[PDB]
Design a protein around this ligand. Structure first.
Ligand code: FES
Length: 97
């Protein structure tokens, strides 16, 4: 009934925020103090890498750009870029990678 909102848990700070769907993880991490770093405005640096603990199915699929910057920065199977990863619904749990 609230399909336009999603819960996002930053486990390094133990807080779950209810975000409007389509919000990027980086747009909440600094609001709660999570240690995810915003280091560029072009999606190329990869310093915003984030480990997706749960709920990867509720996230926007990675673009070809994200995949390239992920691989360039040794991102793993469950890592995503916080400045490019949008929460589309459901429940997601993340920690700084
Ligand atoms: S902040 Fe640079 S890739 Fe996300």
């Amino acid at each position: 009934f609230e399909k336009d909102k999603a819960t996002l848990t930053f486990t390094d700070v133990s807080i779950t925020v209810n975000v409007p769907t389509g919000t990027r993880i980086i747009e909440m991490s600094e609001k709660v103090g999570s240690g995810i770093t915003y280091g560029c405005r072009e999606g190329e640096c990869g310093t915003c890498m984030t480990h997706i603990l749960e709920g990867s199915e509720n996230l926007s699929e990675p673009t070809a750009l994200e995949m390239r910057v992920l691989e360039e920065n040794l991102g793993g199977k469950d890592d995503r870029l916080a400045c490019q990863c949008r929460v589309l619904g459901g429940a997601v749990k993340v920690r700084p990678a």
